[PDB]
Structure formats: C-alpha cells, structure tokens
Coordinates of C-alpha atoms and ligand atoms in Angstrom, one line a residue:
X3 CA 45.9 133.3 -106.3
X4 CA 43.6 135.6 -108.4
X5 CA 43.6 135.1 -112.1
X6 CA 43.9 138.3 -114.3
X7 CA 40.7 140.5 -114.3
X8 CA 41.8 141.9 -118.2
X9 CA 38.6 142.3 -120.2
X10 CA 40.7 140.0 -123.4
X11 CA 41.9 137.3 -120.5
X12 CA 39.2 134.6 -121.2
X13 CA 40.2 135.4 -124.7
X14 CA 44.2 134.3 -124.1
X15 CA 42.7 130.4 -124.4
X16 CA 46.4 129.3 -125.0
X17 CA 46.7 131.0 -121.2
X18 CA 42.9 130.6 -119.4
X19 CA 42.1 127.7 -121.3
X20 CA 40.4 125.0 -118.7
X21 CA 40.4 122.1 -121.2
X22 CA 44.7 121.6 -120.7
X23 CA 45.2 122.7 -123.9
X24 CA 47.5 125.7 -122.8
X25 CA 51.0 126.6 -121.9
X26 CA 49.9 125.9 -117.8
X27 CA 51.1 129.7 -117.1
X28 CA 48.9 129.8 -114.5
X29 CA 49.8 127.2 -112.3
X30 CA 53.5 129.3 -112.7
X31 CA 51.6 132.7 -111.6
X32 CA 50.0 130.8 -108.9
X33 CA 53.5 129.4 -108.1
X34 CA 54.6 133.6 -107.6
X35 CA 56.2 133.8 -110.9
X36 CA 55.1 136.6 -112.7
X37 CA 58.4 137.8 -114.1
X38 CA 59.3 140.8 -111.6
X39 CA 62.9 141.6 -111.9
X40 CA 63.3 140.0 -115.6
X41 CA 64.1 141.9 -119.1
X42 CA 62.6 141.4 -122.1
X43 CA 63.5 143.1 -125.3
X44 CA 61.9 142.1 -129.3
X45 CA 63.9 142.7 -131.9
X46 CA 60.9 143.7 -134.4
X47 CA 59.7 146.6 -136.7
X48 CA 59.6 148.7 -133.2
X49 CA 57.3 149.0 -129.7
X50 CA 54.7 151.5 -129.2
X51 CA 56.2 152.1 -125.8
X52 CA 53.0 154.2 -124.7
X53 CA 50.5 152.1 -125.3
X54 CA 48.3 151.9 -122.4
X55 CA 48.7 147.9 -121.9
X56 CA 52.7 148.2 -122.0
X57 CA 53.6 151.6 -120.7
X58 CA 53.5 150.3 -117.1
X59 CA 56.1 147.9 -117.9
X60 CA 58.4 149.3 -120.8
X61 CA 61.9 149.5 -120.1
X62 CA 63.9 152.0 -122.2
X63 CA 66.8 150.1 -121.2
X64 CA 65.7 147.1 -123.6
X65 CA 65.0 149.1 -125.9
X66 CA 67.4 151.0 -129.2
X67 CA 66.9 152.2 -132.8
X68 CA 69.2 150.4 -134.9
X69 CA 67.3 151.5 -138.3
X70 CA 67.7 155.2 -137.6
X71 CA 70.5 155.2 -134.8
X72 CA 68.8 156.5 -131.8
X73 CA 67.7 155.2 -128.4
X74 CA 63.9 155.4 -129.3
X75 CA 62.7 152.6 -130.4
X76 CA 58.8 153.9 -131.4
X77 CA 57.4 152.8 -134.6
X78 CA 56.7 154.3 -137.7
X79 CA 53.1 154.5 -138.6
X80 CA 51.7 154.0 -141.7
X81 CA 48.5 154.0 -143.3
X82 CA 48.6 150.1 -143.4
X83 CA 49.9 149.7 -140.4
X84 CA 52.8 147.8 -141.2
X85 CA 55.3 148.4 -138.0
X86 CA 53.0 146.7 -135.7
X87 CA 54.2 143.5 -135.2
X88 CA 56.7 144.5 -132.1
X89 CA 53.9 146.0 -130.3
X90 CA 51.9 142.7 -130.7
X91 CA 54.9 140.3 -129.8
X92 CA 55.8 143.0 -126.6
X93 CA 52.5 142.3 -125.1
X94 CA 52.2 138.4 -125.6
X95 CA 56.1 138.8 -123.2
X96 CA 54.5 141.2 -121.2
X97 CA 51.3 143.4 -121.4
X98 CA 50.5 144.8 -117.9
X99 CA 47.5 142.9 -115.7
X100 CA 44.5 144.1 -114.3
X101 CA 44.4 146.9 -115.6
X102 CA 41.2 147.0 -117.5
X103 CA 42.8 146.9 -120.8
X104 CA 43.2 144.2 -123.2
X105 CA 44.9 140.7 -121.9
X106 CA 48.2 140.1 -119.9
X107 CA 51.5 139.0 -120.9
X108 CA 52.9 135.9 -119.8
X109 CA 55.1 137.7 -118.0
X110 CA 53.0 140.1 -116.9
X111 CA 55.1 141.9 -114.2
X112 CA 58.9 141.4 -116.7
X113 CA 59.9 144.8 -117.9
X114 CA 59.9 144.6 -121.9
X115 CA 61.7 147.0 -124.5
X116 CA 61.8 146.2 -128.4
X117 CA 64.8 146.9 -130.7
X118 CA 63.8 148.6 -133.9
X119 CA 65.9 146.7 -136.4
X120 CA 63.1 145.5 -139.2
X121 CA 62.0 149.1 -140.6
X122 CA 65.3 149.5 -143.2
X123 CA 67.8 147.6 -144.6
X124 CA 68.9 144.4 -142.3
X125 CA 72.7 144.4 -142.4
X126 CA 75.2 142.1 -140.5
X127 CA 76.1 145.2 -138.5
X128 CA 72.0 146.1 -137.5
X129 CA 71.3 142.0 -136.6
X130 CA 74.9 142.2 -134.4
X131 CA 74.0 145.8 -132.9
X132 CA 70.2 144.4 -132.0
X133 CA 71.8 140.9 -130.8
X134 CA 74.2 142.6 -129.0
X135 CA 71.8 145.1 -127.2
X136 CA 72.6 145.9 -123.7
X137 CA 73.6 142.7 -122.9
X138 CA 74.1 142.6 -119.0
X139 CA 70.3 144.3 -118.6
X140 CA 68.7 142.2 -121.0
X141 CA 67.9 138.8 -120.3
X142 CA 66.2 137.5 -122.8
X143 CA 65.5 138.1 -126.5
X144 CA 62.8 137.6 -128.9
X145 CA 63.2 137.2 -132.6
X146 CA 60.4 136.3 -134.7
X147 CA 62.3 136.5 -138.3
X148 CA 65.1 135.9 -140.1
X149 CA 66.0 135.0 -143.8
X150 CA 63.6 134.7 -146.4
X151 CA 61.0 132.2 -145.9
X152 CA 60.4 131.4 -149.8
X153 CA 61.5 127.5 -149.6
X154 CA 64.6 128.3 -151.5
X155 CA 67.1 130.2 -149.3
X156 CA 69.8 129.1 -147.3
X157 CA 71.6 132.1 -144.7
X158 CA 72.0 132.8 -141.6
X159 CA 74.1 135.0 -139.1
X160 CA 76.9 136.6 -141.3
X161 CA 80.5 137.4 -138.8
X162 CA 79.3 140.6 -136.9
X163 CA 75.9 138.6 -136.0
X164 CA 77.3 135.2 -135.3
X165 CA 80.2 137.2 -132.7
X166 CA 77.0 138.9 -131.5
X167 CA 75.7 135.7 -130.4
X168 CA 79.2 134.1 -129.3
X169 CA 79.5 137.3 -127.2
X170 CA 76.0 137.0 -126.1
X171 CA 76.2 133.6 -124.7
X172 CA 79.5 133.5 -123.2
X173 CA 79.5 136.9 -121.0
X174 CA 76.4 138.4 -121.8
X175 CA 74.2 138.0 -118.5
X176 CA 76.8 138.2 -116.4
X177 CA 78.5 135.3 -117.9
X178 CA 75.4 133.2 -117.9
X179 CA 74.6 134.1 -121.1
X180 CA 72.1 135.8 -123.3
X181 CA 68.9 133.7 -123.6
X182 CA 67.9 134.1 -127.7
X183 CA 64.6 132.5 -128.4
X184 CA 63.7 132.5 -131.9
X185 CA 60.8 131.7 -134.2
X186 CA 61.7 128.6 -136.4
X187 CA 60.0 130.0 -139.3
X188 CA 56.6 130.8 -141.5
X189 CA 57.2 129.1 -144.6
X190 CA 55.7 125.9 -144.8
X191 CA 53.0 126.8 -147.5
X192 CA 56.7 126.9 -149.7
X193 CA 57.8 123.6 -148.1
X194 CA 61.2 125.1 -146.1
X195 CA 63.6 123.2 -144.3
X196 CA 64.0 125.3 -141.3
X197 CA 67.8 123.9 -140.8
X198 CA 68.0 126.1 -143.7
X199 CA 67.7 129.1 -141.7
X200 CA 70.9 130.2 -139.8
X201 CA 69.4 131.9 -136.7
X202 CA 66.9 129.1 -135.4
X203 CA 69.5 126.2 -136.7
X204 CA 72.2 127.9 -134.2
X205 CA 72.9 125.9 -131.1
X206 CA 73.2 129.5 -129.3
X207 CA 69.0 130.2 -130.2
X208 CA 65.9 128.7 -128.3
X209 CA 63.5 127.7 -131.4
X210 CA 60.1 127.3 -131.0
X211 CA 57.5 126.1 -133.5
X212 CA 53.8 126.4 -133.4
X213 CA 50.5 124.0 -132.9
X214 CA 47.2 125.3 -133.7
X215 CA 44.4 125.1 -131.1
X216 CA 43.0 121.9 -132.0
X217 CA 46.7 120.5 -131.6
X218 CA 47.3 119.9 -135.9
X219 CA 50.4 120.9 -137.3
X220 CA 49.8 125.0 -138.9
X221 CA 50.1 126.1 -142.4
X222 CA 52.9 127.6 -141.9
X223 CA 55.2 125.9 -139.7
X224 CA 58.3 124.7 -141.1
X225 CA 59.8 120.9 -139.7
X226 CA 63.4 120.4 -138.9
X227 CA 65.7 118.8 -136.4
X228 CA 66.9 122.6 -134.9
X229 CA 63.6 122.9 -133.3
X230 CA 63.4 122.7 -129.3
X231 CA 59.9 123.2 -128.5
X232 CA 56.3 124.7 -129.4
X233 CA 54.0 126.9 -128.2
X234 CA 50.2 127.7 -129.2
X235 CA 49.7 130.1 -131.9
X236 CA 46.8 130.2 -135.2
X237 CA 45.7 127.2 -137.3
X238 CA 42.7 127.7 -140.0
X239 CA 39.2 129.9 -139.5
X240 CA 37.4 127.9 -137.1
X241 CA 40.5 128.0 -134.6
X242 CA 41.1 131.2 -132.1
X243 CA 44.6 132.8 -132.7
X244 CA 47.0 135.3 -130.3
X245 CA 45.4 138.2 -128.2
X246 CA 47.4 141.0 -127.8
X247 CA 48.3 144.9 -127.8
X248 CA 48.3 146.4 -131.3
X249 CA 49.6 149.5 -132.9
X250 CA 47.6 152.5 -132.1
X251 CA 46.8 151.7 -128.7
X252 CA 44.4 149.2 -129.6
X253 CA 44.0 145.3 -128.9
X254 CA 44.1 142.7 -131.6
X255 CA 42.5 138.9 -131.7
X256 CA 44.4 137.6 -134.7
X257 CA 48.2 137.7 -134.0
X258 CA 49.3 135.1 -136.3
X259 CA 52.0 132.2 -137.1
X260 CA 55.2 131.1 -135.9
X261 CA 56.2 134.7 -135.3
X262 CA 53.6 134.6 -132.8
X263 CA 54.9 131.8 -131.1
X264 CA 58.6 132.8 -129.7
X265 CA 57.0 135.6 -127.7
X266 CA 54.9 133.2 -125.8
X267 CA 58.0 130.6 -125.3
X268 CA 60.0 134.1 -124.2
X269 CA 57.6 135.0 -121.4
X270 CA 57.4 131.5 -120.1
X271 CA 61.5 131.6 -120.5
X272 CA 61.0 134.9 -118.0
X273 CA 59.1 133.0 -115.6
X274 CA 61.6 130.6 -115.6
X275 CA 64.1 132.7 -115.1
X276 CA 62.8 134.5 -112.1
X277 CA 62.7 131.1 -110.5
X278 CA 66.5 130.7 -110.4
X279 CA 68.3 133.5 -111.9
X280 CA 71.2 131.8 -111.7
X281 CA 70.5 129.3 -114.7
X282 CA 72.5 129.6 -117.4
X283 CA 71.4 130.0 -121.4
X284 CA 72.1 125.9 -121.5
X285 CA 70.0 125.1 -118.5
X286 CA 67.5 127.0 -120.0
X287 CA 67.9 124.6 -122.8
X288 CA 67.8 121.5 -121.0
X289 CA 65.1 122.5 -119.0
X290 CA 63.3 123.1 -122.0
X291 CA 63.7 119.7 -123.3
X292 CA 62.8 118.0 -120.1
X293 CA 59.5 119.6 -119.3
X294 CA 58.1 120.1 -122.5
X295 CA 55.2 117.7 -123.0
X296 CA 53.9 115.9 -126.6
X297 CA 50.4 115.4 -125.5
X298 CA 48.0 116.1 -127.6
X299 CA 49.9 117.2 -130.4
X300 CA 49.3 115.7 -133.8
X301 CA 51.9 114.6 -136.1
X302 CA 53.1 111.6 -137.9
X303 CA 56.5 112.1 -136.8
X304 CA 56.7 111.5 -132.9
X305 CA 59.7 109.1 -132.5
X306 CA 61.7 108.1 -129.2
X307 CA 64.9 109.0 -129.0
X308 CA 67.7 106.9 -127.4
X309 CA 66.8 108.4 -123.8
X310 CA 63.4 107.9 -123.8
X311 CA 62.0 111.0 -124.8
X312 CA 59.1 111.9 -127.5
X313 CA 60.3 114.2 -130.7
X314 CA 58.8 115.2 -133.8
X315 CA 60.5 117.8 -136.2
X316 CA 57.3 119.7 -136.1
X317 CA 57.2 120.4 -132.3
X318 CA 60.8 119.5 -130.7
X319 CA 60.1 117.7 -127.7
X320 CA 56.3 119.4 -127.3
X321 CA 54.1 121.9 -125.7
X322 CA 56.0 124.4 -123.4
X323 CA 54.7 123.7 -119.4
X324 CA 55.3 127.1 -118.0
X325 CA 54.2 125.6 -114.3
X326 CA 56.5 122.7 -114.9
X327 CA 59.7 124.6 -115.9
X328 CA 59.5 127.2 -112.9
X329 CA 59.1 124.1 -110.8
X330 CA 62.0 122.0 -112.3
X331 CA 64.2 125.6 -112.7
X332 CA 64.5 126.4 -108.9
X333 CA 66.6 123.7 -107.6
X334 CA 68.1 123.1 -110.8
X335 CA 71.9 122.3 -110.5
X336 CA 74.1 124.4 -113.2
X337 CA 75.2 122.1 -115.8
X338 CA 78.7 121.4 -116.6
X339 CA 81.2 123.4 -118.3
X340 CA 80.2 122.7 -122.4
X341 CA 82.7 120.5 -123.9
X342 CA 83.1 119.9 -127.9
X343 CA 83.9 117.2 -129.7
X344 CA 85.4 117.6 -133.7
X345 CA 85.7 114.6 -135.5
X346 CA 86.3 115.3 -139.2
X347 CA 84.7 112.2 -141.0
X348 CA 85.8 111.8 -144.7
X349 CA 88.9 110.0 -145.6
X350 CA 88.1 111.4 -149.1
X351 CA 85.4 112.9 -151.2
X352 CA 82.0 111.2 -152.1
X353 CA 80.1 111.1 -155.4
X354 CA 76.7 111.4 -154.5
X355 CA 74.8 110.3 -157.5
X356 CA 71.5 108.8 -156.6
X357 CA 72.1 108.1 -152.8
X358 CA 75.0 108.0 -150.5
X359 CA 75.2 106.8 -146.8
X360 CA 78.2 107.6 -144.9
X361 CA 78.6 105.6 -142.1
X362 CA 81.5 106.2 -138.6
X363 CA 82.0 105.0 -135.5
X364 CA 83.3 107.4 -133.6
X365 CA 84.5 107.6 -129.9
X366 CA 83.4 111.0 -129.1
X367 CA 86.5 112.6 -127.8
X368 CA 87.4 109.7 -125.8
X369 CA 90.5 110.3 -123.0
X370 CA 90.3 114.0 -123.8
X371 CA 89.3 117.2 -122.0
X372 CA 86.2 116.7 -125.1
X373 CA 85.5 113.7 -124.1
X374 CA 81.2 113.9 -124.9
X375 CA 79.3 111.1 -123.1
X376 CA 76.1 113.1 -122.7
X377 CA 74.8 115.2 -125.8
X378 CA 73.3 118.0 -126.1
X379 CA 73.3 120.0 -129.8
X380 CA 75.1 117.7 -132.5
X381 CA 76.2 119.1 -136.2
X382 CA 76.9 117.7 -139.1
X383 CA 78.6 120.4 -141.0
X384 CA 78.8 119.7 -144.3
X385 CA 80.3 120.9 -147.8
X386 CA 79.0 119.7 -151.0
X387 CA 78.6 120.7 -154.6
X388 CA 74.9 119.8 -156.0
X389 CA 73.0 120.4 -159.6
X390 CA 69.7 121.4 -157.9
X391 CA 69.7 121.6 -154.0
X392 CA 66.3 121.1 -153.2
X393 CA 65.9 117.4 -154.6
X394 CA 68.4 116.4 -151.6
X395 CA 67.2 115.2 -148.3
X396 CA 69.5 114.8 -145.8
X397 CA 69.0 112.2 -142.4
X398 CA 71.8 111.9 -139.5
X399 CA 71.2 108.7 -137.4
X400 CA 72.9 108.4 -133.9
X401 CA 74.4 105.6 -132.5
X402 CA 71.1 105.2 -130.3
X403 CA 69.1 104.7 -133.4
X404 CA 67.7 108.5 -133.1
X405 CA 66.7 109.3 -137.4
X406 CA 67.6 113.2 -137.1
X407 CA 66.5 114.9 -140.7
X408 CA 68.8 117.3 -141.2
X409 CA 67.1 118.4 -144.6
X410 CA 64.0 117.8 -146.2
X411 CA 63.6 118.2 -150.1
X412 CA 62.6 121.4 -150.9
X413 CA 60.8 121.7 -154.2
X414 CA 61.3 125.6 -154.5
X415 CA 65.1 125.4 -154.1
X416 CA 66.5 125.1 -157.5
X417 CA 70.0 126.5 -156.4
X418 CA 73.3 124.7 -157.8
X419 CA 75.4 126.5 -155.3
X420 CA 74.8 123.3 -153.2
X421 CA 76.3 123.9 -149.2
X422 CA 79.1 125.3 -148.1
X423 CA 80.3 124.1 -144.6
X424 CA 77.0 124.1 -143.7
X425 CA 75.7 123.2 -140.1
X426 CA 72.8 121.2 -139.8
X427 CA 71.9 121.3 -136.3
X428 CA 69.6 118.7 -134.3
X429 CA 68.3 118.6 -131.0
X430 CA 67.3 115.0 -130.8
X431 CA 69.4 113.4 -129.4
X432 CA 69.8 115.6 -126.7
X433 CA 71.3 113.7 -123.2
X434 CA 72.3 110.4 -125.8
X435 CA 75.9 108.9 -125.4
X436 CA 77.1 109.8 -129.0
X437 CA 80.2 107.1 -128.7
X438 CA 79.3 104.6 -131.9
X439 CA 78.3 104.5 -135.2
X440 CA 76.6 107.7 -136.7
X441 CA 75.0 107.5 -140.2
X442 CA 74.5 109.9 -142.8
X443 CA 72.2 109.0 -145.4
X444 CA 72.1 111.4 -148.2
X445 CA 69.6 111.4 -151.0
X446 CA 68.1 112.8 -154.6
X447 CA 64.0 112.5 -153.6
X448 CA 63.5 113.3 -157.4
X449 CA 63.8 111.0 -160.7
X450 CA 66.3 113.6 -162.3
X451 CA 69.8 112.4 -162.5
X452 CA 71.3 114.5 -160.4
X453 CA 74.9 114.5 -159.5
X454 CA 77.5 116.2 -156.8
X455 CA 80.4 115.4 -154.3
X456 CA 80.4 115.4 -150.7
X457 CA 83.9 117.0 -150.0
X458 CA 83.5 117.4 -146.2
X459 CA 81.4 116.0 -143.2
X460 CA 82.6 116.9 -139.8
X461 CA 80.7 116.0 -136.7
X462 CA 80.8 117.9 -134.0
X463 CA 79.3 117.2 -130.6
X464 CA 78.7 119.3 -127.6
X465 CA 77.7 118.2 -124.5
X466 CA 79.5 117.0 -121.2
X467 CA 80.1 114.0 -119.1
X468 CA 78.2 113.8 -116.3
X469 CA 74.7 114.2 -114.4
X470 CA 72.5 112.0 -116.4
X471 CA 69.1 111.4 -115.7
X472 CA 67.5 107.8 -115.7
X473 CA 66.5 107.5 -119.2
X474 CA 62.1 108.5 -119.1
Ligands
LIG1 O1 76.8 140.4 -144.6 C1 76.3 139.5 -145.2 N1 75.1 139.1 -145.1 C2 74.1 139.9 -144.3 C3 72.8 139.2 -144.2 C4 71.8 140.1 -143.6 C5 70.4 139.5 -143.6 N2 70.4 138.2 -142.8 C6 69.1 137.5 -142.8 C7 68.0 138.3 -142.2 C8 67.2 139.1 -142.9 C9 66.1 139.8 -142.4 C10 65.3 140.8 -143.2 N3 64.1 140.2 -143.8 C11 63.2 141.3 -144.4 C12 62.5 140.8 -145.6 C13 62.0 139.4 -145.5 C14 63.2 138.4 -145.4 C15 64.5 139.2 -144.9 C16 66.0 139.8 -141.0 C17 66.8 139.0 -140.2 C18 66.8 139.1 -138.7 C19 67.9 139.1 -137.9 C20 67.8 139.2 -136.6 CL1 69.3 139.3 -135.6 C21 66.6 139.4 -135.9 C22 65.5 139.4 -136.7 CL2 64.0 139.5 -135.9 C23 65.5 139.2 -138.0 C24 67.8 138.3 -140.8 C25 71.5 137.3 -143.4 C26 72.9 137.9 -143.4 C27 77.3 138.6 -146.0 F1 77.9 139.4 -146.9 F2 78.2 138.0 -145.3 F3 76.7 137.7 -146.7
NAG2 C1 75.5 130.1 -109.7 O1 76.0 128.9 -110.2 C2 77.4 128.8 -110.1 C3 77.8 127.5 -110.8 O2 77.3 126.3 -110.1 C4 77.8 128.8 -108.6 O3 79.2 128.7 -108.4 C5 77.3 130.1 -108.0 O4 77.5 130.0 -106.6 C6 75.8 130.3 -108.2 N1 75.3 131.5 -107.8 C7 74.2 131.7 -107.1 C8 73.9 133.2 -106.7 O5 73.4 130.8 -106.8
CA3 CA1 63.6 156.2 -133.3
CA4 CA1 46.0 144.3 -119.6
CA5 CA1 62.5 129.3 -143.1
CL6 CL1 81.8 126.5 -130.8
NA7 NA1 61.6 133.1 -140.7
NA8 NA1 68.2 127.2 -132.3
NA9 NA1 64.3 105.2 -130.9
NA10 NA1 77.5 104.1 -128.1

C-alpha cells in the first residue's frame, strides 16, 4: 500500500499521524477500503463542485438546492466568504488523492455531493427536503448544525423533518436505511446540554463529538448521554486543526470545531460501508460502539457501563478506529429486527421542589413481541412544567448501575416553558439487559426555590433479544 502523495497529507495528523493519535484510516486504506462505490452528500451552506480537489469525485446525484429550488448546489460567494463551510466538510468525506493538490478525504475514492440548505431560511419543509434527498443513491449524510447553540434552546426536528428521518431509516437505502451522522454541537463556551438539541439526541442520527490533538476535551464541545463517538478536530493555538478544500479553489489548515468532526466520522462510516454494504443504519451503530476506543482521551467522566464498556458524555464510547470498523463490518451478522418497549412510569404527577427521584422496576416488555433484553438507544421522555429550566439537571440510572445524565444545568436557559414530552436520549447503556429498577433523579443545581411538576415519564427501550456478546 502506498500512502497519499497530497502535498497537505503530512498535514491531515488526525490521518498520517505516526504517534496513534489518529482515526487509523490508514490501516482501512491498506485494508482496500477507500470508499469506491459509496455516496456521500453534506447538508451545508453549499459545495464548490469544481474545485480542483473534489471535481474528480462530485456526484450531482448527492447533490440539490433546497434554498433556491434547483438541482445546483454551488455556493454563493461573498466577500467574507461565508458559504464555505460545505466545501471544507466535502473534502474531509472525500477530497480526491494524489493528485497534487491539497490532502485527501477519508474517503478518498466515495463520490460526495452537498445539499444547499443553510444559505436562507431553514424551515421544517428545507431540513425534510435535504433529509430526505435522494434517498436510495445516497448513503450517508453529514450534518454539522442544527438549532441554536446559545445554551438556552431546546428544538429539534419539527413533523416534515422527523418523517424525513423515519422515512430515511426505514426504506431509505434500500431498506437498510439512511445513515445520518451528525455533529453533537459547538456550544460549550455557553455551557449546552446537547440532549437539548433534537437532531443529535435522535436515536435515528450518528453523533460525534470532538477531542483536540493533545486528547483534552475542546472549547466547544457540548457533553451529553446522545453522543456515540468522537473524532479529532481543533483544541487551543498550540494544537493543529482540520486540513481541507476551501471555497475558491483553495486549501485551508484551520477547519474548526465539532462541525469539523461529523465529516471525518462520515468518511470513516463510508469505509465501513464499502466493507459490507449490506449493514444496516443500526449495525452501523453498534459497530460504532464496539470499536470505538477511549485511549488517550482526557476527561473526568469515563465510567463503565453494565457491559463492560468505557463512556464519558464528552466522547461516547471514544476515538473512531476506521481500520477496526472495516475489519469488525465485513463479517458482521445483520442485527435483529428493532423491538420497542413503552412503559409509561407515573401513577400520578410529581412536585419537584428541591429534588425528586423516581424510581421503577420494570420488566422490559416481558412475554411480548417487545420483549427488550439487550439495549440499544433508551428514552426517558418527559413532560414537566419548571420556573427556570436551566437550574435542572436531570440523571437516568439503569438497572446495571449505568448514571446516564440526561441534562446538565444550563446557566443561560432561563426558560419557564419547562419540557414538553421531551426525549432525552442515551447511548450508555447500549447492549445492557434493561429488566429492573431504573432511577430518575431530578434536581434544582441552584439555591433559588424553584418549583414544578413532573406530569409524565415514559421509558421507552429499543433493542432486541438476542446475539450478545461476552461482556469486555
Ligand atoms: O416548523 C417548526 N419548526 C421549524 C424549525 C426549523 C429550524 N430547526 C432547527 C435548525 C435550525 C437551523 C438554522 N440555524 C441557522 C442559524 C443558527 C442556528 C439555526 C439549521 C438546522 C439544520 C437542520 C438540518 Cl436537517 C441539517 C442541518 Cl446541517 C441544520 C436546524 C428546528 C425546527 C415548528 F413550527 F414546528 F416549530
Ligand atoms: C443482507 O442481510 C439480510 C438480513 O440478514 C439477508 O437476508 C440478505 O441475504 C443480505 N444480503 C446480502 C447481499 O448479503
Ligand atoms: Ca443553485
Ligand atoms: Ca488531493
Ligand atoms: Ca447545542
Ligand atoms: Cl419509534
Ligand atoms: Na449545533
Ligand atoms: Na444521535
Ligand atoms: Na458501572
Ligand atoms: Na435486570
């Protein structure tokens, strides 16, 4: 195998790095993976579809104009060059190798299109039209974005978008579904809760946060149970940050944040899935959560879960292993059918006050068709009336003793609108039995007296029944 020959390639350190503190992409090109025969498309501000490093691969097929309703999807240029973040997250999927010009994607052979769907107003009809894209070409999607990362917003996919995504996963890709990997979020100098954001707290996205070169926890990044895993992305001025094609035809060193991030995981998803095309948008998942490695990644909140495994709200279960997941993907067996278990928890409402804990021991669908004895995604969606949303943090405990924070106090969020069947996702305690006693500890993290009801908590469990793993 002969690594890239790109004059920027010893510059991709989070790909040519020698020191094992990179994605291992090229132990996955060196496997054959390279992402021939796999689509692509970012839903951004636009792609400059003729730039030199991305011509070779651009696929017009991936690619729409939802902003101005028309097939091209070329950006508009501006004097501060504001529409070129699709052209820098294209190339981290899939700029074209040895070729004399910049770096290389991860997926350097993938065909990649972009969906301009950022330059204008973001309705539920552009996200579902973008989502929704040419769904039995495209494989995979990108999404660096999504509601407002000021610390104080809750929102997420509105009906046309959240059909987009059940249509997506359940006959999109032939009926393997749509793979959406999303950015978990950029606002972390505004202390956000990224559970808080609809898009990367769905069960139907891939989220990805970021780590900074010297393995430290970015500015930016936002912590919360959605999150699956991490890629590499920028940290502070002594650390190197993303290398890839920029607007005007040029080649940019400082791509930037977690935005930066869920183009990497996308291309290592497109390696992946030219190792067995056959996996579905849940094997991707697990596969995800069982190669994915903590190592060197800092953070103060690495706990085992009831199966073995390493997580930390910052980082998921870890680093994306690009040369572990094509190895693991090609004689992966499909997972079963997904089952769901609804178990509606309160017998009546629950004054809040101070702190509340609710706990239930439940049997997890047991002697049904739903019956749940391996985990994958579990909710607790929840309706309740608060004076000032952000003083609440919110923890969900499985019965394997797994502490998923479903919520984090956020000091910006001053809302009384409180949450309204709201579905706090975590990935935790992925492959757990869930049969037993769940918790749900709810608390005011300020001295205020604050007051509200809990009026609903339903827990619902996906997952199957069979094909576990020895616990790790
Ligand atoms: O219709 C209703 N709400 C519609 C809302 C539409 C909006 N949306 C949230 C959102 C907003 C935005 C736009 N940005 C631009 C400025 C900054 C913060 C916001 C970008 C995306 C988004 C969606 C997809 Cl798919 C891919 C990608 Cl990359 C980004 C997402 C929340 C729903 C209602 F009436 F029901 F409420
Ligand atoms: C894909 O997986 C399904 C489910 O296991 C199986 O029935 C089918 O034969 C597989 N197709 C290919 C081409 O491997
Ligand atoms: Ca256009
Ligand atoms: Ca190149
Ligand atoms: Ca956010
Ligand atoms: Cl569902
Ligand atoms: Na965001
Ligand atoms: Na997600
Ligand atoms: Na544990
Ligand atoms: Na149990």
């Amino acid at each position: 195998y002969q690594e890239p020959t790109d004059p920027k390639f010893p510059q991709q350190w989070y790909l040519s790095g020698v020191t094992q503190r990179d994605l291992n992409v090229k132990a996955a090109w060196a496997q054959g993976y390279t992402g021939h025969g796999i689509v692509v498309s970012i839903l951004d501000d636009g792609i400059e579809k003729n730039h030199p490093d991305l011509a070779g691969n651009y696929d017009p097929g991936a690619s729409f104009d939802v902003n101005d309703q028309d097939p091209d999807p070329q950006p508009r240029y501006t004097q501060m060059n504001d529409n070129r973040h699709g052209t820098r997250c294209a190339g981290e999927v899939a700029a074209v190798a040895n070729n004399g010009v910049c770096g290389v994607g991860v997926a350097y052979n993938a065909r990649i299109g972009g969906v301009r769907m950022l330059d204008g107003e973001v309705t539920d009809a552009v996200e579902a039209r973008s989502l929704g894209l040419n769904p039995n070409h495209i494989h995979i999607y990108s999404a660096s974005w999504g509601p407002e990362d000021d610390g104080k917003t809750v929102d997420g996919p509105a009906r046309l978008a959240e059909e987009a995504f059940f249509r997506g996963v359940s006959q999109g890709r032939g009926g393997l579904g749509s793979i959406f990997v999303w950015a978990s979020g950029n606002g972390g100098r505004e202390h956000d809760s990224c559970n808080c954001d609809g898009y990367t707290n769905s069960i139907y996205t891939l989220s990805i946060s970021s780590a900074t070169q010297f393995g430290n926890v970015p500015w930016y990044s936002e912590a919360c149970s959605s999150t699956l895993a991490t890629t590499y992305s920028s940290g502070n001025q002594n650390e190197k940050q993303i290398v890839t094609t920029d607007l005007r035809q040029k080649c940019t060193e400082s791509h930037t944040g977690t935005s930066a991030s869920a183009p990497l995981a996308a291309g290592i998803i497109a390696l992946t899935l030219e190792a067995n095309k056959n996996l579905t948008w849940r094997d991707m998942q697990h596969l995800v959560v069982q190669t994915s490695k903590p190592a060197h990644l800092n953070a103060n909140d690495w706990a085992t879960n009831g199966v073995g495994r390493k997580v930390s709200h910052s980082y998921g279960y870890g680093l994306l292993d690009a040369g572990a997941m094509v190895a693991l993907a090609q004689n992966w067996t499909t997972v079963a059918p997904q089952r769901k278990c609804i178990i509606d928890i309160l017998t009546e409402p629950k004054d809040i006050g101070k702190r509340l804990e609710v706990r239930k021991t439940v049997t997890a669908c047991l002697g049904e068709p739903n019956h749940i004895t391996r985990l994958e995604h579990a909710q607790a969606r929840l309706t309740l009336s608060y004076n000032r949303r952000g003083d609440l943090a919110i923890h969900l405990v499985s019965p394997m003793g797994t502490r998923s924070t479903l919520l984090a106090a956020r000091p910006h969020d001053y809302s009384a609108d409180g949450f309204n069947d709201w579905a706090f996702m975590t990935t935790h305690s992925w492959d757990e039995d869930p049969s037993g006693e769940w918790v749900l500890e709810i608390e005011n993290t300020s001295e205020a007296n604050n007051y509200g009801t809990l009026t609903k908590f339903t827990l619902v469990l996906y997952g199957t029944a069979s094909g576990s793993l020895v616990p790790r």
